[PDB]
Design a protein around this ligand. Sequence first.
Ligand SMILES: CCn1c(-c2cc(N3CCN(C4CC4)CC3)cnc2[C@H](C)OC)c2c3cc(ccc31)-c1csc(n1)C[C@H](NC(=O)[C@H]1[C@@H]3COC[C@@H]31)C(=O)N1CCC[C@H](N1)C(=O)OCC(C)(C)C2
Ligand SMILES: Nc1nc2c(ncn2[C@@H]2O[C@H](COP(=O)(O)OP(=O)(O)NP(=O)(O)O)[C@@H](O)[C@H]2O)c(=O)[nH]1
Ligand SMILES: [Mg+2]
Lengths: 167, 164
Amino acid sequence: GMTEYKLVVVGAGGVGKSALTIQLIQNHFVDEYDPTIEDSYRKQVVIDGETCLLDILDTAGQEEYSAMRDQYMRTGEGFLCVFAINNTKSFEDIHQYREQIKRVKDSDDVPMVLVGNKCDLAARTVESRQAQDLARSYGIPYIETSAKTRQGVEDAFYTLVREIRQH
Amino acid sequence: VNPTVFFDIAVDGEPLGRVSFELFADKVPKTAENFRALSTGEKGFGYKGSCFHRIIPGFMCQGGDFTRHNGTGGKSIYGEKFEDENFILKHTGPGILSMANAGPNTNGSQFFICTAKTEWLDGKHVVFGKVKEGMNIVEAMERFGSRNGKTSKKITIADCGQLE
Ligand SMILES: CCn1c(-c2cc(N3CCN(C4CC4)CC3)cnc2[C@H](C)OC)c2c3cc(ccc31)-c1csc(n1)C[C@H](NC(=O)[C@H]1[C@@H]3COC[C@@H]31)C(=O)N1CCC[C@H](N1)C(=O)OCC(C)(C)C2
Ligand SMILES: Nc1nc2c(ncn2[C@@H]2O[C@H](COP(=O)(O)OP(=O)(O)NP(=O)(O)O)[C@@H](O)[C@H]2O)c(=O)[nH]1
Ligand SMILES: [Mg+2]
């Protein structure tokens, strides 16, 4: 049987967590805004020659319920921490997500990838260098993605699997 | 005199029963009038035939997307969205009727009916009415919800309108 990886997609509301996940799973860009409660998806993929099963939890970006994230952070094996490159606040919110994951899992070494989404958009407010520096300070990869064009979408999820495998 | 509207609810096309609502036109006239007119359909669009797309037992039943029927749509009688009229009224318990939204000043047609006190929504969602008769129909709709709100049967507003 193939190994299953429990991936969790987190980040501020509207950054494109669902669009990224649905692009990966269904090969479709969701243009509409359907703010998430919580959804789960499954997809088998081949990464570095080994087939595996991605179990992906797509979470809410609702600041009101930050205390309710502990339960899914406990069970997740790796985390995509997503911001949007045209939303500086979403980039500033990354610190709080990473700190919460570290606290809930009681570890400074949790598999995690920093994702700068919406890279198809022209009016960027978060420069790639800023996010690269942040990811370097966390010791984790940074991948720029567009759920709209598919740029980096597979790379983001597959890189997270590699981080889990190398943990 | 505050208006009263009704929904005849169906489950997979079969009648479940009627819920009626008092709309607090005396406190939130603009918001009450939107819901009233969407219930009669007199602008040529409204709630008839639309579904309750999100039902979370212990919390609320949410509906009102009659434009896309997928939880992302709906529109008011004033334009696609309108401002938050006031937050005078609170989510005090089961039966409260309140506007769904996508952030400040984004009321359209989506609404929710509380099945419990939801105090953390005070000041963020405009409360504009309450169940008058048929709260047990709303309780019965909860039977078809789930943790993330996806419904297990199609819960529709088979008919709706205004009562004398
Ligand atoms: C963290 C999980 N989680 C919870 C939640 C929370 C809690 N606790 C326990 C602790 N308690 C403290 C003691 C007080 C606090 C709550 C427990 N268990 C849960 C659920 C069952 O765990 C899966 C929720 C919740 C709500 C959201 C996202 C995640 C959520 C969410 C996403 S979008 C939105 N909220 C507002 C939404 N916007 C749109 O739909 C926009 C669409 C586009 O534009 C028009 C249209 C909207 O207006 N409403 C109308 C109002 C009710 C509201 N939906 C909704 O569904 O709330 C669901 C729920 C369960 C009440 C809250
Ligand atoms: N141009 C562009 N738009 C995007 C991209 N990703 C998402 N969007 C758009 O941004 C909006 C929010 O996307 P969504 O996936 O719902 O974000 P979310 O992070 O899942 N939101 P929530 O936390 O409420 O569930 C939608 O209108 C979606 O089409 C992207 O890469 N490029
Ligand atoms: Mg989402």
